[PDB]
Recover the amino acids of this structure.
DNA sequence: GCGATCACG
DNA sequence: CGTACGTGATCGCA
């Protein structure tokens, strides 16, 4: 059953045809400055395996790789593109990426290797990467014979599956989504990841020392209030101290003991001083372990930069995710944590950080898709949406809206985007289901368009079996027909939320593509560093700030045309912290 | 490995 | 009749 191929000792013309399935294997999960263990090429002339040191040293092969007119079909082209960037080699002409194709066809399949993608089309003549390389620590690159056949089988699968995948994407009206959106975006994310973000390690270490002292102080205070020393991080021990020694009320338990989540502690705070200290300890410990020590662990010792990897084929809604490190969840909500951002600085002298963010893109998207007259008018007047929602549901004028009213109206708006339910809103606001139901009823009386939309999208999910986004991203919801209330409700909330969060993802992704095109046309040095769901962070010479202030918001606001305007705010400064 | 926890939009 | 939507990293413990 073995697959025939040529284990070449050198590159030949036959291997450089204008169309081929290409495999540039990088086994390390984190591909930054990582080894390329082998190369496979499958084209009209046959199947070939090439040793990396050989192929990458061949001028003809390198030229072929960078020739945009020589088309390549691959799986996870970003991985190869980045690994090649670290070697100073440009990869061009990728016309088809099987990973992105599989992802668009069905995000829920969780495709993360050629074998999983091929299985979708009943093609199984290729092994899963885990089977070949192993997992965790027992992982390793096989001997050449085994490695070579595997890479060739992967290239062969890609060669065979391109057409079937493209045909189905076409039937789904997702052909442009792959070719004009996700694939071009992949190249942009590759540049962003490769550029990396500079870190002021001296700043982080200083913060780490100050946090260590404060943690010591709070730690001693906790032992003092508990009447003894114990492992504050030990659930078993903390549980005994709080709910047994100190007799605090037990409101929530886990599959092993008592729950001490912030949500629980906040309600226990009034009963004992030790609680606020535990919450504070939690806050500092989180910053220290995850954002100081953790971050320092992945900073490149030579350049002092961090190179995240944006997983473009993971989320069920079309969003990106970020890892090692995750640069999409750096603190900002609480001032003490926000300081962490002072450690993220420009990569060059006299450059600055520029951040642009969409204002209420999810609710604006909702106004558009639901075609709700009241909601669309609200955004056309660029009103404070939470104050406006409070005015409508509580039947009062703007001057009569109290802070508590805006807060609750805001919670209602979050629930609306998440997939509203009386139980969900009730838990969030700490009110009764009946009271929550009333808020929801009032909301729908004021936004009948949204109500009709939520009713219709759930019905559509049942009829078609999936929901879609503005640019035709898809998410199947088989549980929408479940006869189990909890299971079905999960699916219903997904039907309501996915088109909103997903369309917002579509919009910013297109904005990124449009932005890079504009930056190149203007030959600006400014470039993207990060994307945080509804915001874009760039760095650029101080001399380019004025032009960026006009260019970035415009490009983001014009990415797509909706029934309501899109609004973008922006800030810039010496550090990410200051870009506010 | 996995549940609890908490960081972000 | 009971979960708010979407993610990732760290730590304690089986
Ligand atoms: O290269 C990113 C791409 O690879 C997948 C597997 O096909 O994920 C791998 O790489 C990630 C980044 O290092 C890891 O977080 C993940 O654990 C590893 O399997 C895809 O999911 C992703 O799109
Ligand atoms: O009472 C109708 C109302 O209930 C929802 C759930 O909030 O859907 C339920 O009723 C539908 C029939 O009207 C079913 O198709 C659906 O499976 C069931 O959960 C809303 O979508 C609907 O407006
Ligand atoms: Mg914003």
């Amino acid at each position: 059953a073995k697959m025939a191929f040529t284990l070449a000792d050198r590159v030949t013309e036959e291997m450089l045809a204008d169309k081929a399935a290409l495999v540039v294997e990088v086994v390390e999960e984190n591909y930054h400055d990582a080894p390329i263990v082998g190369i496979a090429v499958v084209n009209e002339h046959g199947r070939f395996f090439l040793r990396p040191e050989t192929a990458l040293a061949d001028p003809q092969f390198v030229a072929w790789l960078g020739d945009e007119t020589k088309k390549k079909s691959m799986f996870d082209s970003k991985r190869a593109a980045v690994a090649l960037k670290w070697k100073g080699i440009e990869l061009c002409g990728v016309s088809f990426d099987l990973l992105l194709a599989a992802y668009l066809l069905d995000p829920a399949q969780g495709v993360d290797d050629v074998a999983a993608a091929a299985k979708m089309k009943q093609y199984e003549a290729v092994r899963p990467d885990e089977a070949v390389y192993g997992k965790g620590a027992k992982r390793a690159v096989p001997d050449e014979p085994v490695l070579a056949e595997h890479l060739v089988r992967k290239a062969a699968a890609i060669w065979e599956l391109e057409r079937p995948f493209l045909d189905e994407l076409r039937r789904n009206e997702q052909d442009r989504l792959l070719v004009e959106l996700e694939q071009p975006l992949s190249s942009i994310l590759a540049e962003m990841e490769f550029a990396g973000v500079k870190v002021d390690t001296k700043r982080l270490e200083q913060m780490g020392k100050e946090l260590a002292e404060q943690l010591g102080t709070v730690e001693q205070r906790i032992y003092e209030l508990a009447g003894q020393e114990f492992n504050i991080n030990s659930p078993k021990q903390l549980g005994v101290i709080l709910f047994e020694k100190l007799q605090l009320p037990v409101l929530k338990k886990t599959k092993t003991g008592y729950s001490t989540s912030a949500d629980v502690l906040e309600k226990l705070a009034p009963y004992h001083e030790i609680v606020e200290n535990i919450l504070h300890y939690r806050q500092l410990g989180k910053l220290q372990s995850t954002y100081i020590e953790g971050l320092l662990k992945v900073v490149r010792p030579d350049t002092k930069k961090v190179h995240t990897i944006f997983n473009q084929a993971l989320t069920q809604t079309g969003r990106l995710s970020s890892t090692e490190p995750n640069l999409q969840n750096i603190p900002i909500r609480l001032e003490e944590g926000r300081k962490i951002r002072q450690a993220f600085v420009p990569s060059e002298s006299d450059w600055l950080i520029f951040a642009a963010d969409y204002s209420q893109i999810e609710l604006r998207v909702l106004a558009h898709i639901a075609e709700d007259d009241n909601l669309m008018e609200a955004f056309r007047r660029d009103l404070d949406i939470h104050t406006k929602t409070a005015m409508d549901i509580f039947q009062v004028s703007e001057d009569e809206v109290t802070p508590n009213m805006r807060r609750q109206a805001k919670a209602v708006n979050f629930g609306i985007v998440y997939g509203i339910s009386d139980y969900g809103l009730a838990q969030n606001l700490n009110i009764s289901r009946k009271e929550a139901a009333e808020f929801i009823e009032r909301y729908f009386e004021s936004f009948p368009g949204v109500k009709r939309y939520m009713e219709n999208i759930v019905q559509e999910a049942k009829q078609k079996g999936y929901v879609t986004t503005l640019l035709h991203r898809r998410r199947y919801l088989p549980d929408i027909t479940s006869r189990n209330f909890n299971v079905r409700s999960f699916a219903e909330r997904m039907a309501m939320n996915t088109p909103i969060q997903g369309s917002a993802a579509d919009i910013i992704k297109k904005a990124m593509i449009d932005l890079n095109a504009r930056l190149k046309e203007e030959r600006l040095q400014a470039h993207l560093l990060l994307q945080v769901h509804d915001e874009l962070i760039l760095e650029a010479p101080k001399e380019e700030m004025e032009r960026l202030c006009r260019l970035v918001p415009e490009v983001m606001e014009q990415a797509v045309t909706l029934r309501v305007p899109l609004k973008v705010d922006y800030h810039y400064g010496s550090t990410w912290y200051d870009a506010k």
User: Anything to note?
Assistant: Residues 235, 254-256, 259-262, 282-283, 286-287, 290-291, 319, 326, 328-333, 337, 357, 362, 501, 504, 532-535 of chain A lie near DNA strand B (CB under 10 Å from a C1'). Chain A is about 50% helix and 15% strand.
